[PDB]
Amino acid sequence: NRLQGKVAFITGAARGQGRTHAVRLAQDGADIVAIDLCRQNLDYAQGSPEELKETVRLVEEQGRRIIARQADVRDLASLQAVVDEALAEFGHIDILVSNVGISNQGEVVSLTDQQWSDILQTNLIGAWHACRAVLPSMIERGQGGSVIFVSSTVGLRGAPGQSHYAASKHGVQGLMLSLANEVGRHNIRVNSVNPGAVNTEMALNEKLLKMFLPHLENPTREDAAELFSQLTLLPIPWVEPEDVSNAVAWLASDEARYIHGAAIPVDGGQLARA
Amino acid sequence: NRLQGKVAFITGAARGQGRTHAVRLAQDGADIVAIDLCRQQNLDYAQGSPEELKETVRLVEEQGRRIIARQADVRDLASLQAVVDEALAEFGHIDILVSNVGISNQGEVVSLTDQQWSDILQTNLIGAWHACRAVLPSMIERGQGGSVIFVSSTVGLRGAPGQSHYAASKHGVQGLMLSLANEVGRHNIRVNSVNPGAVNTEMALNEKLLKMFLPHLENPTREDAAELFSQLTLLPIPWVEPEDVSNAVAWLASDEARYIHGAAIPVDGGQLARA
Amino acid sequence: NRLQGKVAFITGAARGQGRTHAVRLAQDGADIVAIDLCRQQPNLDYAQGSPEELKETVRLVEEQGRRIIARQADVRDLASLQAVVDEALAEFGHIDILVSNVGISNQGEVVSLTDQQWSDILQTNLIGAWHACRAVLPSMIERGQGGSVIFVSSTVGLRGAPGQSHYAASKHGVQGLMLSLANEVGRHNIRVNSVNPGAVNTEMALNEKLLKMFLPHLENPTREDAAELFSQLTLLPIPWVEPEDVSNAVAWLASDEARYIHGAAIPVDGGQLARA
Amino acid sequence: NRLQGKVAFITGAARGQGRTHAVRLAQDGADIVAIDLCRQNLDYAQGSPEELKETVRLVEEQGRRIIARQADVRDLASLQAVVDEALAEFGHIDILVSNVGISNQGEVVSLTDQQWSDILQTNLIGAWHACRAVLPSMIERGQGGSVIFVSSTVGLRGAPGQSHYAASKHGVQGLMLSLANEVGRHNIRVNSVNPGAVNTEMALNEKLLKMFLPHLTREDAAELFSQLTLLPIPWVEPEDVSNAVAWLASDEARYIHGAAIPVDGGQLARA
Ligand code: NA
Ligand code: NA
Ligand code: NA
Ligand code: NA
């Protein structure tokens, strides 16, 4: 197991991308600390308690140990509570996966204070909170570790109709680079993965599709494939959550021990498109 | 007279960088709408006062320009809308928006507080968006294009240990900049950032900030500051001046720069290029 | 009069972007050293600089009230450039601003490009740019007044370009040269930057052979067909920038207004690089 | 065995970075086509025919096949001859590792025409030659593939005293991005790995160290270079670069395209 004896803390783990992170790192021998708000302003399906229970089953199916808790990344104390439990049961946290957050839509002149507040609190402040909660024990344990920020192509380019979301993931990259300069010295590697279109309910939701395809009354998954296929260079409409999780699992492994300060696009060429 | 007939809306205009924006654009013919909070805040440097805003007004009127200056809070959309409405009533149009510097304070990732993150984002990122929200509808409707210049920082393009919230906030401004550039380019509204490194201002050279970089020194001086920051620049300078930032702003606003769009221009004597 | 008293050395000055740089820096009060190969190269399918076109650049600069030394020269040949610099220095005493111009291009996919295309494009665009630096810089260091080096690059110095990988490699190379040079001569108060135009209104950027690559469904593409293509690439409502626009950026970088801009690559592209 | 059934063509494979790539891919089950000029203006030990035999020995010890040939990346025909032999023997080439090239020193005013010609010819034109030689079969087979340029942190930042080397590796990035746009549609993935200081003769030789430490060993190297990394290391190992290359060629990284991955312990991110 490439991650044998490691413990990975994963946010948004009830479903989607966060679930795939837990199973994939579990596959590599990592025990898991999993949190999700487990509650449904956002126009797609989010995690539930039943879905977190499935994440648990799936990780336990791989022969691993898991602590799964309802928690709120927007709330430091809520995270510290779970970190404290993990540490009492597992002794250490070696890998932090600050997963993907939330998004909704609108133009600069049309966005609301509520939309800015929500997106920053969840996507930026929440990523910082996970860091603030986990790093003290990681620094104290003295064995190094990994902080992987699950960001986005919109952390590295503009996104019309999504300026708040792009501002938030740009902010995550600023956090990442700043963190890399603080905790490098401790052998704590800090990197981002930057997916483009991904096969999830969050990335492919009808509301978002309508913004890009305002002429269509009910845009379908086929319509989405036709839109997003033009953005990738590879013959694909989007990557899978597993492709993002594979990158995360590699960064956490000794194979990638000296990778630090990187933003790795997982996008089939979107960011390289001429 | 490169900006004759234009009106520029400038934030943090009471002193320092914002003041120099106001004076420089006025020198080129722009009339001015200037706001500042005019309150000394959680920060460890001198900030703008009402008396300093009055002096900004004297300096602009001495260039033969018109100015509307008001106390306003960029953190509060309704407060900015009130000023924009007055400006549009008096001046008819706002052609240039300069979203100026914001605020900072210090701390490592593990030691920063919620208050620090909240405050820095609210002023530096939300505040910048509020100025855009407040100003763009009239600029779009007026139909003659215009300019949005975000005054950011080298830490919107690189990390800053001990300043992760600040760097996050300025990265966020770059993200806002690039997105807006895709939304309003079509209206011939040009959107760019200027990205100063170390600048000669009370905000960039304040003692608490200097002590972060120089923790062994008991009372780091301006001369200690020169010796530190000089190592960062490639040009033989300790830092740029506020005037150098304001020149870049005034160039972007002119017809000489009419098709520059989506650009982040470092005004840093080479800091970002340093090998 | 923002450049009064300055001497600008400009490559590829016969027509197109080179001419506009000469004229625009002249307008700002700089005297001009202008070089162009002045030969129609058969490996390039667009009108290039000719002696007659250099004579008209001379006429336009003198009409602004400026002096100009205009010479046929090959940037691919170090000795050729050193001879023009030595003449410049004998007549004017100093060279303050080096404008390393846009160079040349032709088309081909990675699997289809020839050794000749690679050798040609790098010789003129990259080695040539270094030649200009190699030849002008010793005097500019010795004289101890600082100066400006301004590379005229491209959006394809900052992104990939399908069908033009040698051209995009050459301008990426120019960026690497710029940044390295920035680290060497910064201490001398010599500022080093690039300007990076997108689609610009010249024969090099809009010639029919190039358009055909981009519009393979069109038998004989026109300037209208070019406008309709390139307009989709800019965020501003224009088909391309004008070479005057590139020159205004050059002229500003050379001025005291931009005295501390160093190590920058400024896109002049109506938002092409920022497009989502 | 992540690379089972694949054939990797590796340039500069006699020693150093090149050799570790061969062995690392062989470890993942790839067969290998290895070339090196095998010949000594460069102030460090370069590959020899004896070092190529040892690369063969180490790859064979993994139970793989290898075709190892003296060839010159500066000469397209020389490369086409080796590609044609590999195709006659293996039937296909799936992975191209355009590995690391050469360097020497000089400021912009002090470099020679010969210095620029040699560095561009080996580093940039050589890299293009490899692509030119390998891609037609790779496209025609219609199975996709991987092109991995071994580049440098100096393809992404400036390098005082090394402007020609930095120009060459910036150039590699341009070729990479351009190529990514041409052959993506064929499911041919194109990326770069960008190491900083690496533990090799080329990265660490005394002539180069002198340029960086003009007031003056390995220990001298490590004390200087340690300042550049954020992690507590003096440099990466060649094995670290080879690990990145091997991951990118695997199904684990199947959709990573147009990326430049720094392998530098934080050098590019340093504030
Ligand atoms: Na596609
Ligand atoms: Na300096
Ligand atoms: Na357009
Ligand atoms: Na280090």
Shortest CA distance to B155 belongs to which of A182, A174, D269, C260?
Answer: A174
**Phi, psi (rounded to 5 degrees) for B244:** -65, -35
Shortest CA distance to A146 belongs to which of A95, A110, A102, A86?
Answer: A95
Tell me the residue type at A106: G
Q: D interface mutation test: which of B213, B229, B232, B274 has the most D CBs within 10 A?
A: B274
CA-to-CA separations, A228 to A63, A199, A212, B153, in angstroms, rounded = 37, 11, 10, 33
DSSP, collapsed to helix, strand or coil, labels residue B35 as strand
Is D191:D258 a contact under the CB 8 Å cutoff? yes
Shortest CA distance to B150 belongs to which of B119, B120, B121, B129?
Answer: B129
How far apart CA C31 and CA C54 sit, in angstroms, is 16
Q: Decide if B142 touches D, using CB distance below 8 A.
A: no
Shortest CA distance to D6 belongs to which of D68, D80, D74, D86?
Answer: D86
Q: How far is the CA of C162 from the centre of ligand 3 (A)?
A: 21
Terminal CA-CA length for chain C: 39
Is C39:C48 a contact under the CB 8 Å cutoff? yes
Interfacial C residues in 161-220 facing B (CB < 8 Å): 179-180, 182-183, 186-187, 189, 191
How far apart CA D127 and CA D145 sit, in angstroms, is 17
Contact A128 B117 (CB under 8 A): yes
Q: Which residues of C105-144 are buried (b: 16+ CB within 10 A; e: fewer)?
A: bbbbbbbebeeebbbbbbbbbbbbbbbbbbbbbebbbeee
Told to judge if B259 belongs to the known catalytic residues of this protein, a careful annotator would answer no
CA-to-CA separations, D152 to A244, D169, D260, in angstroms, rounded = 25, 7, 9
How far apart CA C276 and CA C45 sit, in angstroms, is 32
Element (H, E) at B211: helix B207-213
DSSP, collapsed to helix, strand or coil, labels residue D146 as strand
How far apart CA C114 and CA C121 sit, in angstroms, is 11
Number of Cβ within 10 Å of residue D201's Cβ equals: 14
Contact D232 A185 (CB under 8 A): yes
Is C267:C15 a contact under the CB 8 Å cutoff? no
Number of Cβ within 10 Å of residue D136's Cβ equals: 14
Interfacial A residues in 57-86 facing C (CB < 8 Å): none
**Phi, psi (rounded to 5 degrees) for B70:** -140, 145
CA-to-CA separations, B57 to B94, B135, B245, C121, in angstroms, rounded = 18, 21, 20, 55
The two tokens of residue A139 are: 């620094």
Q: Decide if D157 touches B, using CB distance below 8 A.
A: yes
Shortest CA distance to C146 belongs to which of C95, C110, C183?
Answer: C95
Shortest CA distance to B103 belongs to which of B84, B117, B83?
Answer: B117
Total tally of structural domains belonging to chain D = 1
Q: Please provide the size of chain B in residues.
A: 275
Chain-centre distance of CA D76, in angstroms?
18
Chain-centre distance of CA A95, in angstroms?
13
Interfacial A residues in 252-271 facing B (CB < 8 Å): 261
Contact D253 A255 (CB under 8 A): no
Ligand lying nearest the CA atom of residue B236: 2
How far apart CA C31 and CA C67 sit, in angstroms, is 5
C269 torsion bin: left (phi>0), alpha (psi -120 to 50), beta (else): alpha
CA-to-CA separations, C232 to B88, B137, C228, in angstroms, rounded = 34, 24, 7
Number of Cβ within 10 Å of residue C74's Cβ equals: 18
Chain A residues with CB under 8 Å of B126 CB are: 113, 116-117, 120
Chain C residues with CB under 8 Å of A160 CB are: 276
Tell me the residue type at C190: I
What's A177's DSSP letter?
H
To 5 degrees, how large is the angle CA C42–CA C43–CA C44?
A: 90
Please give the full DSSP string across B69-120, using - where no structure is assigned: EEE--TT-HHHHHHHHHHHHHHHS---EEEE-------B-TTT--HHHHHHH
Tell me the residue type at A268: G
Cβ neighbours of residue B238 closer than 8 Å, sequence gap 6 or more: B198, B225, B226, B227, B229, B230
Q: Please report, for the domain that includes residue C57, its CATH number.
A: 3.40.50.720
Element (H, E) at A246: helix A241-251
A252 burial type by CB count under 10 A (0-12 exposed, 13-18 middle, 19+ buried)? buried
Q: How far is the CA of D56 from the centre of ligand 4 (A)?
A: 35
Cβ neighbours of residue C32 closer than 8 Å, sequence gap 6 or more: C7, C8, C10, C13, C22, C25, C26, C61, C66, C67, C68, C69, C70
How far apart CA C30 and CA A226 sit, in angstroms, is 54
Cβ neighbours of residue D250 closer than 8 Å, sequence gap 6 or more: D2, D3, D28
Cβ neighbours of residue C228 closer than 8 Å, sequence gap 6 or more: none
Q: Please provide the size of chain A in residues.
A: 274
How far apart CA C180 and CA D107 sit, in angstroms, is 9
B165 burial type by CB count under 10 A (0-12 exposed, 13-18 middle, 19+ buried)? buried
Chain B with chain C: Cβ pairs closer than 8 A:
118
Question: Taking the CA of residue D152 as centre, how many other CA atoms within 13 Å lie in the half-sphere pointing to its CB?
Answer: 28
The two tokens of residue C145 are: 């007044």
How far apart CA B207 and CA A9 sit, in angstroms, is 39
Is C139:C89 a contact under the CB 8 Å cutoff? yes
Q: In 3-state terms, chain D is what percent helix, strand and coil (to 5)?
A: 50, 15, 35
How far apart CA D210 and CA D205 sit, in angstroms, is 9
How far apart CA B226 and CA B234 sit, in angstroms, is 13
CA distance B41 to chain C (A): 32
**Phi, psi (rounded to 5 degrees) for A226:** -65, -40
How far apart CA A59 and CA A33 sit, in angstroms, is 11
Shortest CA distance to B138 belongs to which of B70, B72, B76, B187?
Answer: B187
Contact C185 D108 (CB under 8 A): yes
Terminal CA-CA length for chain A: 40
Shortest CA distance to A244 belongs to which of A272, A187, A202, A207?
Answer: A202
For residue C33, the cross-strand partners are: C9, C69
Chain B residues with CB under 8 Å of C245 CB are: 258-259
Element (H, E) at B165: helix B164-184
Experimental method: X-ray
Tell me the residue type at D165: Y
Contact C137 D109 (CB under 8 A): yes
The two tokens of residue B79 are: 């407060």
DSSP, collapsed to helix, strand or coil, labels residue A191 as strand
CA-to-CA separations, C247 to C8, C20, C33, C117, C244, in angstroms, rounded = 12, 6, 16, 28, 5
Is B9:B135 a contact under the CB 8 Å cutoff? yes
Contact B266 C268 (CB under 8 A): no
Ligand lying nearest the CA atom of residue A228: 1
Work out the angle between the directed axes of helices C128-142 and C165-185 (0-180°, nearest 10).
Answer: 10
Cβ neighbours of residue D6 closer than 8 Å, sequence gap 6 or more: D25, D29, D30, D31, D94, D95, D249
How far apart CA B69 and CA B42 sit, in angstroms, is 25
**Phi, psi (rounded to 5 degrees) for C104:** -140, 165
Residue C245 domain boundaries: 1-276
Q: How far is the CA of B239 from the centre of ligand 2 (A)?
A: 8
Cβ neighbours of residue C15 closer than 8 Å, sequence gap 6 or more: C47, C48, C49, C50, C53, C57
Contact A272 D181 (CB under 8 A): yes
Q: How far is the CA of D64 from the centre of ligand 2 (A)?
A: 54
CA-to-CA separations, C9 to A29, B210, C100, C210, in angstroms, rounded = 64, 43, 8, 29
Chain-centre distance of CA D228, in angstroms?
22
To 5 degrees, how large is the angle CA C249–CA C251–CA C256?
A: 110
The stretches of chain D forming alpha helices (DSSP H) are: 16-27, 49-61, 76-90, 113-120, 126-141, 163-183, 201-204, 206-212, 218-225, 238-248
CA distance C205 to chain B (A): 17
**Phi, psi (rounded to 5 degrees) for B273:** -90, -10
To 5 degrees, how large is the angle CA B97–CA B101–CA B105?
A: 155
Chain B residues with CB under 8 Å of A173 CB are: 171
**Out of D135, D163, D258, closest to residue C180 by CB:** D163
Torsion, CA B255, CA B257, CA B261, CA B267, rounded to 10: -140
Q: Provide the sign of the torsion angle of the four alpha carbons D160, D162, D164, D168, taken in this order.
A: negative
Q: Please provide the size of chain D in residues.
A: 271
Number of Cβ within 10 Å of residue B32's Cβ equals: 30
Resolution (A): 2.0
Number of Cβ within 10 Å of residue B16's Cβ equals: 23
Shortest CA distance to B196 belongs to which of B257, B141, B149?
Answer: B149
How far apart CA A69 and CA A75 sit, in angstroms, is 14
Cβ neighbours of residue A258 closer than 8 Å, sequence gap 6 or more: A189, D231, D233, D236, D240, D263, D264, D265
Please give the full DSSP string across chain C, using - where no structure is assigned: -TTTT-EEEESS-SSHHHHHHHHHHHHTT-EEEEEE-----TT--S----HHHHHHHHHHHHHTT--EEEEE--TT-HHHHHHHHHHHHHHHS---EEEE-------B-TTT--HHHHHHHHIIIIIHHHHHHHHHHHHHHHT-S-EEEEEE--GGGSS--TTBHHHHHHHHHHHHHHHHHHHHHGGGTEEEEEEEE-SBSSHHHH-HHHHHHH-TT-SS--HHHHHHHHTTT-SSSSSSB-HHHHHHHHHHHTSGGGTT--S-EEEESTTGGG--
Q: How far is the CA of A266 from the centre of ligand 1 (A)?
A: 14
Question: Taking the CA of residue B119 as centre, how many other CA atoms within 13 Å lie in the half-sphere pointing to its CB?
Answer: 12
Is B173:B152 a contact under the CB 8 Å cutoff? yes
**Phi, psi (rounded to 5 degrees) for C78:** -60, -45
The two tokens of residue C227 are: 């406008």
What's A156's DSSP letter?
S
For residue D24, the cross-strand partners are: none
How far apart CA D18 and CA D28 sit, in angstroms, is 16
Q: Provide the sign of the torsion angle of the four alpha carbons B173, B178, B180, B185, taken in this order.
A: positive
For residue D32, the cross-strand partners are: D8, D66
Is C120:C170 a contact under the CB 8 Å cutoff? no
The two tokens of residue C251 are: 């002229």
